[model samples]
Target: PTHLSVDTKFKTEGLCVDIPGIPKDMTYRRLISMMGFKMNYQVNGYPNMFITREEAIRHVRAWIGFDVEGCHGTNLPLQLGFSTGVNLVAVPTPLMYKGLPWNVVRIKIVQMLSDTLKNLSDRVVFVLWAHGFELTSMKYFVKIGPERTCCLCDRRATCFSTASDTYACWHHSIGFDYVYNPFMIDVQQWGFTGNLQSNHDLYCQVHGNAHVASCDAIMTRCLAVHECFVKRVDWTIEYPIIGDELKINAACRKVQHMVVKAALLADKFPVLHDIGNPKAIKCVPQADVEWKFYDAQPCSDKAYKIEELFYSYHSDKFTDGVCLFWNCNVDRYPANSIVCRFDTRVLSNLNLPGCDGGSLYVNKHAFHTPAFDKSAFVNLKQLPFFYYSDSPCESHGIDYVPLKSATCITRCNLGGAVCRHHANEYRLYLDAYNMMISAGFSLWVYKQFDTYNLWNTFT
Candidate 1:
């Protein structure tokens, strides 16, 4: 594609003049160069957290346009989502999916910057690093070499055993007069008649009948790599580029040209479909459960809603078998029905209601339950101290009652009885009570024998 040529010149006080070195007709090569310079400098200083944050902020600001219906703002420059944190790397929340045409937004941004920096001699360029520019899923996709014909571009190109043995056609080979046959793609691949007589003029007017496959597919590929650079930490940190007006345009244009060249010279090239989708992403073994759960859910963690869900999960432990993340269609009755919350601290598990048959129900009358009564107990030799285990695997029930204490368990408000004790002392006391029962049984047997002997003597 040709470079964007429209000039964003405005009237000055005294005379009309073009900025030196800044071309009236901007080329794709120049745009790429500008982006490259800005990205490189910022990336080079990446170990310094401040630099990356600033670069992210600058690019984000440039994309958000003056308030024009679907645009983000007007007259005022856009602000970063976060000014002092890792979140600074994120796009401003409001501008993420704003309903505006990208072309209009980009042009206006360039116009605004040109007017603002008109007095200054140095060129100020506005670069838009869109979400599609960040190929966050690159590692998850397959890699195909130049062995297979590109589904979109290289349909009729000569086939060869290997890439080196391949020869290029006139359009793709070393020749200035490059022409294409629309029938090669439209008729051969799509099984459609090329340039029907009815609308021949209309079809030819917009280069619609031309086989422009060489650059069409690569256009998206270039965008994918560009996105990877902006969003992926490894790319940004290792190979930084600056957004100098002329340079960024050059880099962008260079990609355009390279894509065109790639389309021309390739004997065989594979499309993204040839590489299958990734099955799994890298994950820490210990945090796998937590990570998988969070990743599968739809709520935005940045909106404070996820945190609220987490806090509520801890406070109530999803006693109703469903938390905020519950999905009726895909999720089961008990969402995230894990026996343990091992990923987070144990404190988040405290005060949780017990799960039963894989379901948990809230104790509606937690505070209004009947008070503990000593008389209700089937008189034991002695009261044993109550001991509790934190593990979910451990079995517990009403058989173990609480020992009377001045202070009750912090979360439980079930009368004065508190189920808290030192495990060692509680176990010891339980064993002593068992021995006392055995001794009392022996004494009763001896007294029965004595009574029997006296009865025998009287007979």
Candidate 2:
């Protein structure tokens, strides 16, 4: 009978194989062959037939051999269809197929259906079919590519949400390759207060007294500045995907500049001017400011507000003696010279490497360079001067006990070893020789007196 040869009168309840017009004596192989011959094969381009007679026979054998005792007996007919785009080696089954090799039967049937829909180019058309037909037929769908596969690459999709209803791979889903700047400070707190001196009698007033100007209050302001401006770093790009690396670098640099500008403004108003000072710190008159930024932009008032927010939210540890000024070159404040004991007896015990147990005194004067200027306040809005070391003006005298280079041999008549004393040693010897002048003269006078008396006795 033809694949479509089914009457409305023929009915079955549950799943059963029934070809009404065929004789019961006809074998399953013959029924499948008859069905194949009656099928109306259509093709889009040049047609290619995929199914063989042996394949059809094998699938039919598996279906008929399936144990049907567990499943409900056919009282009515129902139709089912399978796809050609997928291998159906593992098919889903209803609860009745539990513990049975019913899946194996399903596998064979769908395998045959897939084979039958393949074209010459090996492309398989998707097919839909139903079982136990009163009037059942199978339809071939357009040969769309397999699902879970991407249309762009024709490979499995990496992303699932896109306009084509197909996803993309990493290269497609993510924009060009980008790198994270590891050196950049990860800011956990962005919102901080800028007003640091509200608790004092005069705003921005700091005193030596611990009670009037608490360590917590001063340290809070200092830490906020370090976190937001001084220590905060920008992300740097190493290698990029599409665009120039300079642009990324420039963008990060600009961000750092903005942050620094804001922080400097904060320091001028609430932090730097108050450090080590007992007087009320006054804000620089805004009218005196006339400056342009690196990007050729005019000075901004927004920095003031940004500084305020930083003061409100962020706080860091109070490191003792840390320089609070932005342009201060020294790491710490109140630079002082260390006085050391110079006695050779004390120094001789210190067997330090490369040290000869001799004292070399260094006199350094501690002074502060111009810490701030008009331009500094106007342009950078930060201090410009810091404590620095100056070159020594002169040296007096040096006392030496050993000379490393002077232990060399000299060209004597029969040179073995001739250690030359350093100039400082010769100077010490000259001073000793001068002290012996009185003793040497007195000894010479006595010798002369004895020689004259002896000569007189001989006459």
TM-score of each: 0.16, 0.14
Candidate 2 lDDT tens digits, 1-459: 212222212122211343444453433234333433231233322122222222221111111111111122134212222211111121223111222232243333333422331111112221101122311211111111123443355633323332345443323333211111000010111233332232222222322213211222222322322332223322221211222223333432332232223233322222222122122222223312222111111111111121321234312211221112211221122211000011212211111001111111111210112111122222122111111111122235444443232211112201232223323433433333333221110000101111112112111
Listed per model in order, the count of residue pairs whose N, CA or C atoms clash below 3 Å is: 42, 23
Q: What lDDT would candidate 1 get against the real structure?
A: 0.22
Number of clashes found in candidate 1:
42
Residue 457 error, candidate 1, Å = 49
Error of model 2, residue 137, in angstroms: 7.3
How well does candidate 1 match the true structure in TM-score terms?
A: 0.16
lDDT of 2 at 262: 29
